[PDB]
Amino acid sequence: SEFRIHHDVNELLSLLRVHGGDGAEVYIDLLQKNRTPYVTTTVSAHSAKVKIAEFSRTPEDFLKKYDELKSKNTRNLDPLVYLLSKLMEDRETLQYLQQNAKERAELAASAAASSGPTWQQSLELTRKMLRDKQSKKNSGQRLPVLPAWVYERPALLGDFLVPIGSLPLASQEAAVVEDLLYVLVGVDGRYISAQPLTGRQGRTFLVDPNLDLSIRELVSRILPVAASYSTVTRFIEEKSSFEYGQVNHALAAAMRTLVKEYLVLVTQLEQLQRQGLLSLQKLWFYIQPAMRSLDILASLATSVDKGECIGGATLSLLHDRSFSYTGDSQAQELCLHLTKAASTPYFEILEKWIYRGIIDDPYSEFMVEEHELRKEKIQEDYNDKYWDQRYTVVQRQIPSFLQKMAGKVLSTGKYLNVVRECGHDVTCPVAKEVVYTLKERAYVEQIEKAFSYASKVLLDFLMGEKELLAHLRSIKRYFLMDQGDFFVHFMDLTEEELKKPVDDITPTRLEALLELALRMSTANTDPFKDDLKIDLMPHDLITQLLRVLAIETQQEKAMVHADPTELTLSGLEAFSFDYVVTWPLSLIINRKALTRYQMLFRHMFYCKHVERQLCSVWISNKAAKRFSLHSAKWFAGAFTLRQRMLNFVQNIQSYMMFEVMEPTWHVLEQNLRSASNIDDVLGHHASFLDNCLKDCMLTNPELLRVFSKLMSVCVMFTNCLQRFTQSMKLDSPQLASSFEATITKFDKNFSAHLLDLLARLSIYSTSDCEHGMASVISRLDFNGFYTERLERLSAER
Amino acid sequence: RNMKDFENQITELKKENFNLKLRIYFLEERMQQE
Amino acid sequence: RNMKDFENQITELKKENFNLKLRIYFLEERMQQE
Amino acid sequence: AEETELFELAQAAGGAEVFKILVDLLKLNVAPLAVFQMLKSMCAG
Amino acid sequence: VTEAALVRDILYVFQGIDGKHVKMSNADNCYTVEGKANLSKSLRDTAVRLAELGWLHNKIRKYTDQRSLDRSFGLVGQSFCAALHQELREYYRLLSVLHSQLQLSLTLRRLLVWTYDPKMRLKTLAALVDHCQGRKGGELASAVHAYTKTGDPYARSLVQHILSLVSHPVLSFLYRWIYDGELEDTYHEFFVASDPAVKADRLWHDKYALRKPMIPSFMTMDQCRKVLLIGKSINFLHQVCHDQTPTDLENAFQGKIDAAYFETSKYLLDVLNKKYSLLDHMQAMRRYLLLGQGDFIRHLMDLLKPELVRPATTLYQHNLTGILETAVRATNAQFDSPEILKRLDVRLLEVSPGDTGWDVFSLDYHVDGPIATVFTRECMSHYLRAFNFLWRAKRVEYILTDIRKGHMCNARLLRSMPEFSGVLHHCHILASEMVHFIHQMQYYVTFEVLECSWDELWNRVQRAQDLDHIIAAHEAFLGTVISRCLLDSDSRALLNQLRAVFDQIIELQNTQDAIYRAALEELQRRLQFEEKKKQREAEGQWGVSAAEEEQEKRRVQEFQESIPKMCSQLRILTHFYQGVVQQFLVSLTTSSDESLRFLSFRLDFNEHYRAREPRLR
């Protein structure tokens, strides 16, 4: 998506085959700080042109190529010419590039050795290609094609289909003026004949050789009007087809009106001639205004056709031409008329997409391109597509004077789409039509206020029909404790079967127990409990996170591909919660957010499970209530160990509850109340997840590994001790011989593990500053009973 | 040099190297499932 | 530590981030090409 | 991609390898000065 | 041939096209008869006399055609070409009206009486075009203005109309530059050129500038400067602050521009002082970066004392941020705007293990957007140097206060033997001298730099109404502070000796800390010995063991014999300090300005200095 720059620069570095230096990575960072959703590279192309020309060894070639590229009006030309012009200032850089090119060419050669133009056909090919492209893009709707006879029944559009040498001067002049009158309407005369040519241009007109040099030269000066008329009639007839977009058709209609006015003028000239009191000079003077106007129109038409430009880019071209003809009254007025006419449909579509958000793409020239996509797909798939490749910006077509506010437009419309597909759209209180204006402040201000209105109404809608606040309150109630009764009942009902192998687990009974607990409680006040489900994720925290983190060093494929099927998984690890919500209701709860929530919830739940196991172990042993406390040795020593474990877990859980939940929750619930647009709440939720996941410090391999080891060893001790208690009870193999001062061995391992964990925490904190770990260590060892050992171990490291 | 308050930007860079580090794992595991 | 430690670790972390970006790009192109 | 036009402008360059992939960065509103100094540094090595 | 053919041909030539019996001789690039068209010499003379209009028409047509085939010429050039086209059209109108009379002969005299006025106007236009080639932009106006004062009221009127027509593009460009402030110039014809090679803050002096060769003729340098200032302000209104607001005549045009400039400057200053309130920036900077409210620094030192003593290689920002936040939440400075509070931070220069933590520790204040544009890195560096010196002064004063309170605690807690009498009294005397000097210096620095320069700067800015005034005032204030801070290149010796004084102060502080450590160790040993004696007596053993008595006498005697060495080294350090301060005073005796003289005279609270150095008297 937006990462093309990294791939391109990496490929450039590889092709240049240079290893020294820090590479372009710092240069990539520098480039990243020049981001815009549009182009603003307009610079002095004249300076670059002159800088190239002064060095240009063959100036004519460069001039012709640049002029042709300008005629095509392709983008990116200005920055490329800028780079080319400033390239030769660094002769060493040019030499380096030339040497690299020579080396690459030689390497490729070694590897290989070892290992006239008819216009009608061109127009037909162009229209066929455009039809094919629009049919491909449409993909699901009828093609608005026209019958073939529109181009047939020729002469409908109006294209072209007696000795005079010794005659008197006045007679031949009269005949010539009659012929011109018939030719100014693009109709073949008797002594002046249009001829087919080669290439795309006007038609050359031939006359009798015996005609006088002066008169023939004058009529040659006159005929450019006829040539422009021929070109414009060809343009209007050929561009009238549906497949050229609405804007081109507005241009076509304007041309039709203007040429009709020109026909009115020429017929008035004809009726004046009917009196037989006209000559070359009179008509020559009369046509000059229309002559220049048709010159302008012919230039516009030829530029547009040679550029093959369609859509808003056409408006950009027309606006550029209008500005280039600034300072001339009639030209400016004509350009104003044409640009207003062209923008009319475009501005209609823009207003529809801005106020109502309804997209209308008869041929997909609007600035917002919609890609077919579904909503359940993103809820199911982790990859991000909706807000990235649903309503994208088309750069091939851009409006010259809207670039500075291009991106904003997108957001506005997309917001409306959210309230459009929900089927709860209303007419905006302000419906002021947007109109073309030579300046820009008016429309930028109007679109800005429309954006503000859209954002506020969308936020009100979320706070209303969707009640995002209540859903967030619920998703905080679940996955984050604070439902003590619910969690204790769930544990008490799920523990017995939680230890069964996963393959023997069917979530039907799990959800049955979940609903039984829900109905057998007093926490039903929440009305959104019906969007939860129980899943058995086929992986654990330790392996999942180790795969996530330990990458790109030596473990890209070393152990990521290992499949848990080769091993056995119990019902405690895979167990997790999943949430499903509809698209309009809390779209913010994305599959990514679901993943973060489930990871955090399963970690916290495993910690709670360990605490419950320790508490149950404490509960089981009570025979020593009024019996010998000191005696029984290893039936009584374990006491101390248990205390330790308890405090430990307590500490961490507290650090997880008060030092994670409170800060992130308060900041989220505060900043959201001041959120302005959807992006604000999206960023707030992302930061909330960031804070929660960083608090637990699950973003490091060593700490995760050591914590998992501690949990595993403590669980092993718990089950071994309960096995010992059961064996003693049934009397009052491996199990019978599991005691060899087992408490001593367990303590010996656990104390070393815990001290190593504390050393890792201290070492990482000394470089990561912060105070969360400081509070953790403060609460871990509040009293002095377990202090000196940590300092002694840290002394020698 | 810097303003000595960059540690927050260090955490932001950790975020940029952790979130897309997570998503790439899902992309990888989806590659093999087909 | 010293001021040089921060810049060194930042440079290596940014190199790792660039590698992550290129790898995710190469995965996304595989996802799209089908 | 204007591949034919890319080749046409490559010929228009008329210098002494493609390297025209760089134009993509221009399409992504990159600062011309930044890319030029990148080229200078790459030459420096 | 007949004269009808001659008139037909001359009419064709008037249109620039050749005639039946008249062509253009390449020998003279002008029209003439041909040897095959022999006729009366008078006819030739009149034809050539008339052909001047045709020749001028050909020249103007060639120029306009050549400069119209190119789109790079310019907007003003396009307007000029359009005006010439209109003039050609009027010439064509006259050609048509005379052709109307052509039907149903004429004579060359009639042509003369119809054309001589066109002859004059075409001569004027020819003189106008030949002084325009290779020229573009505002210079063309000047070229046009080259004929504004010319006589010939008809030609004057024509050229004035052409000027008015072709001046409209530049007028509109200026109007938009003063209202919205944009330069979409493609060939940089606007006198305010630009350099697309600057960032969003250095632009104030690099990107935009003036163009002497292309200054508009109507205006002059001062007008250009004021309009450039207006354009800068308008561009800054939104390009940085992102704020937008709504906004031929010649006699009052200058007054109109002046009023627009005044209102725009006032509005810009209002926007800056409301949205940003640079006054609050200066207030907070003085209050914190220049060591303003004392309680802030006092709490900072109280928190960081147990940490900055050791080398700087073991410092941590997070603690600094936490303690400063706690001080803000606890000190009387809670009223500070949280926005301003956030932008404050701490600054590190380098890690020097050979120096204590206090040395390299510093501070800084982040700048951005307009604030960064108005605060150059050089001024920030100068402020940092001033803060370094002021922090050294605060360090020494805190050291002296801490040592005095440590005296009050330990000495009063350890006055039970005559052994420490001499050392303690000597330490009291030297501490009194040090605190006197430091207190006087702090008084001077507080009532010289903190108030005078800052107070005058604030008073001057309160009536200031321009950004240029603000920047000038700030730079002048910085210059005054640095000059009065002894940081100029002409006060090197004074600064060096003051630093030497500070070094001696810290050295004697370290010596006194060592003496404190020795005293504490002796106290611990003595109390331990007394406790051991009590336990011996209470456990059934009477008297003092021989080893115990031997150790006691050995320890007491060795400490007593070492004490005079401490006395002697304290005497030596006091002598060094006395010499250093006396040479400082003799150096200051060459004081130039008045403040130093007032300090020298006010240094005599003891009045016990001139005796050692007779020059002081």
Overview of this protein structure:
The complex is a heteropentamer, with 1 copy of chain A (797 residues), 2 copies of chain B (34 residues), 1 copy of chain D (45 residues) and 1 copy of chain E (617 residues). Chain A has 797 residues and is mostly helical. Chain A is built from 28 helices and 6 strands. Chain A has helices at residues 4-16, 25-32, 45-55, 59-72, 77-87, 91-114, 119-138, 169-183, 213-222, 224-238, 245-274, 280-307, 312-324, 329-356, 375-380, 406-421, 441-466, 468-477, 484-498, 507-519, 541-549, 591-620, 634-673, 678-695, 701-730, 742-768, 772-780, 788-795, and strands spanning 192-195, 204-207, 368-370, 391-393, 532-536, 575-579. In chain A, the strands form 3 sheets. Chain A has a two-stranded antiparallel ribbon. In chain A, strands 3-4 form a two-stranded antiparallel sheet. The longest helix of chain A is centred in the last third of the chain and has 40 residues, at 634-673. The two termini of chain A are 47 Å apart. Chain B is mainly alpha-helical. Helix content of chain B is 79%, strand content 0%. Chain B has 1 helix and no strands. The longest helix of chain B has 27 residues, at 7-33. Chain B is rod-shaped. Chain D has one domain. Chain D has helices spanning 3-13, 23-27, 32-44. Chain E has 617 residues and is mostly helical. Chain E has 4 domains: 3-130, no CATH class; 164-274, no CATH class; 277-375; 410-616, no CATH class. Helix content of chain E is 69%, strand content 3%. Chain E has helices at residues 3-14, 41-68, 75-102, 108-129, 138-145, 153-179, 203-206, 221-239, 253-276, 278-289, 294-308, 317-330, 338-343, 357-360, 369-374, 377-413, 421-463, 467-484, 492-538, 546-588, 595-602; strands spanning 23-25, 30-32, 344-348, 361-365. Classes of the chains: A mainly alpha (797), B mainly alpha (34), D mainly alpha (45), E mainly alpha (617). Chains in contact: A-B, A-C, A-D, A-E, B-C, B-E, C-E. Chains A and B meet through helix 21 of A and helix 1 of B.
Task: Describe the structure concisely for a colleague.
The complex is a heteropentamer, with one copy of chain A (797 residues), two copies of chain B (34 residues), one copy of chain D (45 residues) and one copy of chain E (617 residues). With 797 residues, chain A is mostly helical.
Please state the structural category of chain E. Answer: mainly alpha
| Sheet having the most strands of chain E | 2 strands, antiparallel
| SSE ordering of chain E | HEEHHHHHHHHHHHHEHEHHHHHHH
Structural domain tally of chain E: 4
How far is it from the N-terminal to the C-terminal residue of chain B, by CA? 50 Å
Percent helix range of chain E: 55-70%
Oligomer: heteropentamer
- Helix/strand/pairing class of chain B, anyone? mainly alpha
- Range of helix content of chain B: over 70%
Tell me, briefly, the overall form of chain B: rod-shaped
Q: Give the strand content of chain B.
A: under 5%
List the total number of helices of chain B.
1
> What radius of gyration of chain B results from the CA coordinates?
15 Å
Most extensive chain-chain interface: A-D, 52 and 36 residues
Please tally the helical runs of chain E, counting DSSP H or I stretches of 4 or more residues: 21
What can be said about the biggest beta sheet of chain B?
A: none
Organism (chains B, C): Homo sapiens (Human)
Subcellular location (chains B, C): Cytoplasm, Cytoskeleton, Microtubule organizing center, Centrosome; Golgi apparatus; Cytoplasm; Cytoplasm, Cytoskeleton
Region (CM1 motif) (chains B, C): 1-34
Protein name (chains B, C): CDK5 regulatory subunit-associated protein 2
